[PDB]
Design an enzyme around this catalytic site. Sequence first.
Site, PDB file in Angstrom:
ATOM      1  N   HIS D 144     -12.911   3.582  15.848  1.00  0.00           N
ATOM      2  CA  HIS D 144     -12.693   2.230  16.379  1.00  0.00           C
ATOM      3  C   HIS D 144     -13.403   1.259  15.443  1.00  0.00           C
ATOM      4  O   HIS D 144     -13.850   0.183  15.855  1.00  0.00           O
ATOM      5  CB  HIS D 144     -13.292   2.085  17.783  1.00  0.00           C
ATOM      6  CG  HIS D 144     -12.877   3.164  18.736  1.00  0.00           C
ATOM      7  ND1 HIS D 144     -11.586   3.298  19.198  1.00  0.00           N
ATOM      8  CD2 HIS D 144     -13.582   4.173  19.299  1.00  0.00           C
ATOM      9  CE1 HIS D 144     -11.512   4.345  19.999  1.00  0.00           C
ATOM     10  NE2 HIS D 144     -12.710   4.894  20.077  1.00  0.00           N
ATOM     11  N   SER D 265     -11.759 -14.276  -9.771  1.00  0.00           N
ATOM     12  CA  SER D 265     -11.747 -15.654 -10.237  1.00  0.00           C
ATOM     13  C   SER D 265     -12.952 -15.925 -11.125  1.00  0.00           C
ATOM     14  O   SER D 265     -14.035 -15.382 -10.901  1.00  0.00           O
ATOM     15  CB  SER D 265     -11.763 -16.623  -9.053  1.00  0.00           C
ATOM     16  OG  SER D 265     -11.895 -17.960  -9.505  1.00  0.00           O
ATOM     17  N   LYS D 271     -16.689 -11.847  -6.573  1.00  0.00           N
ATOM     18  CA  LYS D 271     -15.565 -11.638  -5.669  1.00  0.00           C
ATOM     19  C   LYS D 271     -14.564 -10.690  -6.348  1.00  0.00           C
ATOM     20  O   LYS D 271     -14.110 -10.942  -7.460  1.00  0.00           O
ATOM     21  CB  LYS D 271     -14.903 -12.995  -5.359  1.00  0.00           C
ATOM     22  CG  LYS D 271     -13.838 -13.011  -4.240  1.00  0.00           C
ATOM     23  CD  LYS D 271     -13.224 -14.422  -4.076  1.00  0.00           C
ATOM     24  CE  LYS D 271     -12.387 -14.593  -2.790  1.00  0.00           C
ATOM     25  NZ  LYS D 271     -11.086 -13.839  -2.703  1.00  0.00           N
ATOM     26  N   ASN D 273     -10.952  -8.925  -5.571  1.00  0.00           N
ATOM     27  CA  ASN D 273      -9.804  -8.771  -4.684  1.00  0.00           C
ATOM     28  C   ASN D 273      -9.128  -7.456  -5.029  1.00  0.00           C
ATOM     29  O   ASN D 273      -8.757  -7.220  -6.179  1.00  0.00           O
ATOM     30  CB  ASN D 273      -8.825  -9.921  -4.858  1.00  0.00           C
ATOM     31  CG  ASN D 273      -9.477 -11.254  -4.663  1.00  0.00           C
ATOM     32  OD1 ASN D 273     -10.272 -11.431  -3.749  1.00  0.00           O
ATOM     33  ND2 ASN D 273      -9.142 -12.207  -5.515  1.00  0.00           N
ATOM     34  N   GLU D 278      -3.893  -3.305  -1.985  1.00  0.00           N
ATOM     35  CA  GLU D 278      -2.957  -4.090  -1.192  1.00  0.00           C
ATOM     36  C   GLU D 278      -1.512  -3.768  -1.586  1.00  0.00           C
ATOM     37  O   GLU D 278      -0.642  -3.624  -0.722  1.00  0.00           O
ATOM     38  CB  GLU D 278      -3.231  -5.582  -1.365  1.00  0.00           C
ATOM     39  CG  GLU D 278      -4.585  -6.021  -0.821  1.00  0.00           C
ATOM     40  CD  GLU D 278      -4.709  -7.530  -0.726  1.00  0.00           C
ATOM     41  OE1 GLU D 278      -4.379  -8.219  -1.704  1.00  0.00           O
ATOM     42  OE2 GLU D 278      -5.145  -8.031   0.329  1.00  0.00           O
ATOM     43  N   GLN D 310      27.699   5.092  -0.410  1.00  0.00           N
ATOM     44  CA  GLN D 310      27.359   4.456  -1.684  1.00  0.00           C
ATOM     45  C   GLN D 310      25.989   3.746  -1.692  1.00  0.00           C
ATOM     46  O   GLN D 310      25.408   3.502  -2.749  1.00  0.00           O
ATOM     47  CB  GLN D 310      28.456   3.460  -2.053  1.00  0.00           C
ATOM     48  CG  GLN D 310      28.284   2.805  -3.406  1.00  0.00           C
ATOM     49  CD  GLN D 310      29.368   1.779  -3.689  1.00  0.00           C
ATOM     50  OE1 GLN D 310      30.560   2.075  -3.591  1.00  0.00           O
ATOM     51  NE2 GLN D 310      28.957   0.564  -4.045  1.00  0.00           N
ATOM     52  N   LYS D 313      22.157   5.455  -3.665  1.00  0.00           N
ATOM     53  CA  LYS D 313      21.565   5.313  -4.996  1.00  0.00           C
ATOM     54  C   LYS D 313      20.399   4.331  -5.056  1.00  0.00           C
ATOM     55  O   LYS D 313      19.289   4.681  -5.464  1.00  0.00           O
ATOM     56  CB  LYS D 313      22.639   4.896  -6.012  1.00  0.00           C
ATOM     57  CG  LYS D 313      23.673   5.980  -6.320  1.00  0.00           C
ATOM     58  CD  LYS D 313      24.783   5.478  -7.241  1.00  0.00           C
ATOM     59  CE  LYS D 313      25.985   4.921  -6.468  1.00  0.00           C
ATOM     60  NZ  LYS D 313      25.692   3.699  -5.655  1.00  0.00           N
TER      61      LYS D 313
END
EC number: 4.3.2.1
Lengths: 448, 449, 448, 449
Positions: D144, D265, D271, D273, D278, D310, D313
């Site tokens: 949890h 950045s 930082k 990311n 993701e 079809q 593919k």
Amino acid sequence: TDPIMEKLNSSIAYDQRLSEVDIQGSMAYAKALEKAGILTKTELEKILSGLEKISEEWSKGVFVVKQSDEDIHTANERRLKELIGDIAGKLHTGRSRNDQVVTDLKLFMKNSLSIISTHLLQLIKTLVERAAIEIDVILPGYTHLQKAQPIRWSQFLLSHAVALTRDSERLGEVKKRINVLPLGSGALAGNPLDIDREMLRSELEFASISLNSMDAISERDFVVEFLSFATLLMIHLSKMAEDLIIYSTSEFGFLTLSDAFSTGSSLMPQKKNPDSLELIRSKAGRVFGRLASILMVLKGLPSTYNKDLQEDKEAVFDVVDTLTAVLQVATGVISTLQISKENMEKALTPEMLATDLALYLVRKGVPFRQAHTASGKAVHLAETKGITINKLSLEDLKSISPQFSSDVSQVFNFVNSVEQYTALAGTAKSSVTTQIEQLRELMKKQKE
Amino acid sequence: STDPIMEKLNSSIAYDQRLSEVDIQGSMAYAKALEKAGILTKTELEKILSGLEKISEEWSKGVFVVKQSDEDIHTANERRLKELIGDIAGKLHTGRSRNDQVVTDLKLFMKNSLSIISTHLLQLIKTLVERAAIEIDVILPGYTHLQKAQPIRWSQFLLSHAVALTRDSERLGEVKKRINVLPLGSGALAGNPLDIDREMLRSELEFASISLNSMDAISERDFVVEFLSFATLLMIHLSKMAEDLIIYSTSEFGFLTLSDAFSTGSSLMPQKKNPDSLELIRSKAGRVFGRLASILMVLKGLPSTYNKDLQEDKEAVFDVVDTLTAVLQVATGVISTLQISKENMEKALTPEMLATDLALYLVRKGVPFRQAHTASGKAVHLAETKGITINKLSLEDLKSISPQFSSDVSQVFNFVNSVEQYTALAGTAKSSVTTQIEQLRELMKKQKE
Amino acid sequence: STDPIMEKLNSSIAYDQRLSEVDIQGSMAYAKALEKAGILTKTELEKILSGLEKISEEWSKGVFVVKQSDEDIHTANERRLKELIGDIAGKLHTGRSRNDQVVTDLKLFMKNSLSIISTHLLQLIKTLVERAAIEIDVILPGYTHLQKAQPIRWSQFLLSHAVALTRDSERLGEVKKRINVLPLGSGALAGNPLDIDREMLRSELEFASISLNSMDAISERDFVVEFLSFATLLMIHLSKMAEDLIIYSTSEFGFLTLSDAFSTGSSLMPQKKNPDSLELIRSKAGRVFGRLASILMVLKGLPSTYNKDLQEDKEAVFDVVDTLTAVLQVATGVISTLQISKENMEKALTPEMLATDLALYLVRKGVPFRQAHTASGKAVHLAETKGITINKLSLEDLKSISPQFSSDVSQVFNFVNSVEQYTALAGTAKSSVTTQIEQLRELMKKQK
Amino acid sequence: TDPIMEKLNSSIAYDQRLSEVDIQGSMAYAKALEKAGILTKTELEKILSGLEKISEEWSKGVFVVKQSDEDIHTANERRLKELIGDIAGKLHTGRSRNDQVVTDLKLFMKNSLSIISTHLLQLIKTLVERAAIEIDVILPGYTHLQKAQPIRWSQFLLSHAVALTRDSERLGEVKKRINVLPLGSGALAGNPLDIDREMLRSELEFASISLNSMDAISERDFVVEFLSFATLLMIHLSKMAEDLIIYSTSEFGFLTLSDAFSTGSSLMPQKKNPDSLELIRSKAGRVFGRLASILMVLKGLPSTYNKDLQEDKEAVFDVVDTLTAVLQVATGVISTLQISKENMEKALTPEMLATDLALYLVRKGVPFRQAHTASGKAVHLAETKGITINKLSLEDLKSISPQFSSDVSQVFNFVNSVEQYTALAGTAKSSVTTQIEQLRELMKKQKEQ
């Protein structure tokens, strides 16, 4: 930076059709930036001219994409710079990729949905026009794919028009939630320069502006909604394709499609394969898949912006192109198909009038259960004499129920069978005319 | 080899009994129209109605009794009518069929369920907006890629969810308008064969309009798919909100704590609360989505008009309706009773999240976006090399990066000033959040109506 | 103080009672391991086992009585045992957790359940196979695009479904193997803390092996997803067969009829049966797919280790288990009791379908396909001109088209010989069919 | 011949990947045509020579396609003539597009599965190896998303590897059914020229051959199964990604991704990311979407071939490329991420040992109930005394239960905590070692594809 991951972040491979809207978005922003004092009057002119020339490069198809461009926004930004210099940089002041991408996809969708709408109305219109003209043609109505009772070929066509009309109504509902400007939301907390969002909205022609920047940046409701609409639309089209494919079987013989929407072989020039309809039916799965994918992509994601959201573009593009093609293919199939009044008419059989026979009694006071058994008893008889129910003599009928008069002969007429359903929405001639009027009214509403 | 097992699949009585009252209502509406149609004599009518009402009570008091013969709720009600009134109640089936009755019952049921779901949905929205009004001064980190991006008001976060929920409410209304259409009188396929007055039926059953085509009305299940689409997107919204609160309630983030009623603990770790409520809500997104998926797959490729396949709509609609009614109230509870930690939320804000504001400081002084951004990077780097946070760089150090940094730059290193930059409509600035609350309230009015 | 809705939303008692037996057996096995671990004495073990066997009966004779305090079946039993043998029952939970006890019951239930499904699936395949041998002589139209393509043995058709269904059986086995792995002893998430003898638990509960990682064994639901994927593909196969059978039973095709047992009808139209059975089966494809989509989304994005979200597994498993059990049997019934119309089937065989074989005649004579095709084309062409079927063209006429045509070209115009061309492995020739029936019989023996 | 239609049937823009497999399918068939007596030995060598030349063109990547080409098939035929002449036309003899298309896909998928298998095994090996090396690292296990109890970082890594191992087992099971020859089934009833399907098999390296011509032409089980394997695998990857995303947050601070698999950045160099994770997580939806589509396409279709098939593919190509990219990104992330042993350590708290405290009593004979009770009483005591349970003195503990002895001091040690789980699959070191080796064995069995 890894090679494979970079190739995954790279949207430039398919996001190029957003070139114009990205440019339109930039133009409006540049305008709001000048009003805020971030740009001077002259700078704005330089930027706008630059952005306009870039717009031409794409429309002319001469725009050159550098391998260094990961996305369409970077491409235009790079170009604009190598076109007007340093000044170009001031354009990105306070803007973010986060609110640029949504503004871009929404503009594109507003335009695409406008295009999908015309094709949809054209299909509905096509369906209604044949319903008008072929209003006398009658064929069996099916339940469990077993001949149940006679119905007008037009009642069948109209049922598909009515469903599509709902699709059209939903399209409109989705279209207005898309017509809301998200630009000026920044990376997530909003625009930091007190940018005039009203000027932005009217400049880009949106109806209103997004209420909350966190929401505006991370929500993909407009994408899910469009997909939900597109999928149910395909369901309707898959149901119609299924009806027609069947009706076009040599077994049924009800109709055959033109050569343009079917294939064939010189060894059996009397059989036509409804490729067109098979394609339409299959696109239901294709569109549903997109709906399912985006939904799952969104489930579980925390606020606010997440890279996961980039999956939206390919899903919308594929769906926009799928509907656009399938809608037109459907219109053509419907306008250029050839029914067979003969076979459609020979499909009608005396046995189907048995229920109407039971109704004839009900109209003479004879109760429901009682009439049923009477009608069922009448079939058993003609059955044991090797003759259809419309043939058994008036005397034969009398023995089963004195209620049967000489007018009972009227019951054994198909025109009369359908004319029974005058009540609103029935297959009766009058009801069919009403419906035709209603759909045309609804189509006018969803426009003017 | 299973005729009996075949009958079991057609059995619906085990779950469609919640349709008892709508079925009775539909029958009373039809009986009346049957009298106006002369099919029934006035007396024949009064005895039918009185019979349908005795049955109404039997269910509205759990005194009814189903027999091991009742295939469904319909058969179960007509059998009891043939038992109460007698051989006369049989004249009622004249004209309409099960294909006609089915959708009529489902639409009447859904219309009521939707209105109920709307009340719960609106309450949730009012709870978020209300909490946003009171905790408008609370500030915490705004996240992207689950990383601290920049300072935002806790209220902005609450309103982002309320705004999304408001769209859910708008869709609910659109789905309800299309459901509020009378399908009774379409007969088994070609329409009613007795020129039954449908307007009267509409009036009695209280639908807003009457279905346009009998074939469509009997075979379409758009209203079911639409309802499920509304539900799934609503669940997506709730799954996201649950995910956020689950993360914020971890001991790592420590921004908030669920109340005892919407969470669980353990004797050995009293200070530990597991977000049971939020996990349940999140898990319902898949449950609801599955129903959407099943119906869509059930409809695809089916030919006109009616087919047994359509019988699968009831179970999916019932599940989603109950799921939505429970989930929504639990969410209202959760948001209404959770405890936030102003201290930890504020404590999570860092000087590093102000580098962007530092760059904006220069932009407002006229410095080009690029120069400013580059200068903030240098400042960040310098502070880093001196081993200090940027809010501590001396003015001199800042000027060594760019003379544009005046003594007033100190004002940049203030979290309130940071969120207060976002005054443009929809931003996190206080005036903007206040505006959002008014807009939502005014929306809750259009939705309440 | 817990919320009443939160409370109800967390109650599985309403449906998890069917897990009553497997829950007790798990508790019995665990108790025995607790005795060996020195947590329980033989005296305590005997008292516990005896209290459990008693509960077993109470459920068997449906005597067991549940109380409003019973949140789940696990609580119903643990409470009952406490009532029966006093608080000595408490020791039974030592080192055990809902987390690994709940997935233990689910796998046991599914292992048993899958065993029953295998039987029914095999009985369906067998029914299809045996019918194929019996009606191997029957010939009817083969469809492509739902358009008559060429003569095929009816059995070749039944067998294509048996073959697909055997692949379903193979998958059912692959899924059973991974389900047959003991999770008990994984504890809350880090494993069992008492050095419990898992090998002993395995032997008692009869699993084939033991789970490798406590965390994985408590959080994964691969076994559910996999079962649902197997079920969904199975339903697809069934939905396709249903589609075929529904269409064949149409008045229009008239290829076959379903017994009254698996059909529906009216006393007003005796000569007509609605394929309700086949329609139910088709509808269940979506239903089962729904469960698959459901669980996949429930699992997507969930963090390690245990989460309340996983609680959605049971309702999805039960539904599909019951759906398959009911559907598979009905399919068998439908396949065994339906009556084909050899008359209508051969009737559907037309000379136009031999145009293809006409070219093959030339290719065997050495004529390049490109030329032999255009040749057969002139034939059907001149055939229409004279308003006659290609089988009526004269040798003279056939020769004007190609000298290669001889007196034997006459054989090409026979349905039996048409079908008998496909002697190549898996073809529709009788020898190919018999090889198939035999091959399917062998596969059915091994998967046992 | 409608223009929109023609554009809908086109597939040259994406099916070019099937060039080499198509040619191989022709060479095979060509040789089989020579045995049937349709292609003289001289004609056979003529074709095989050309076919190789065309294949040779794609190889060096100098092949050229015309706007007239619609199918990768016609693109190869058209080019066969331009080099061989009219003799090329005989290749089609008794060969339909129906068994030729399903043959290209399986041959392609079989090769794709091999590549995919390799990357999967590479991912598993990366996890298992890192686990062996960092076997001494201990951190909180979550339930949890709340700290539940000490576990070894490797126990965590291994749970994913184990799940991934079953995916690799599903891959093999799927490859098995894909590795079956469908060629020689013709358009529907089988091959009409008694073609030698055993020769085609041997020539196309297939393991066996299709049992029924109709099934081999219309079935897309192989597409479904593959998608089902891919979706289950993506679920696993999305779970692992969620974990790492959460563990990489500032709040958790358990680990940091390398610059190669993350975004950053210049304003906030710290930082990080987790773009890579993701992306991986988002592909789960993308892949499941494909599974969903094909399933809906196949539902309710009638025998035998229909143009609907079809849509396979594009679904296969998308997921094949996605799995290939994602697996390598995963492998990179896991082997180049740096853990914070220190932060994983500081996350272990005394409160998480109350369970172990009760267990200490359980081993000394104290019954579960009473044991759990004494421990909780010890928790309350430390609370009232203003300390943590590990600080309570022997006397403090004795006053709760005489069974407590000076040896209880060892309960308050996180190594000893995880070392309690020696039972198979538990987190004790000996167990983790046993897993690593069981997984190496499993990777071996599978490696022996």
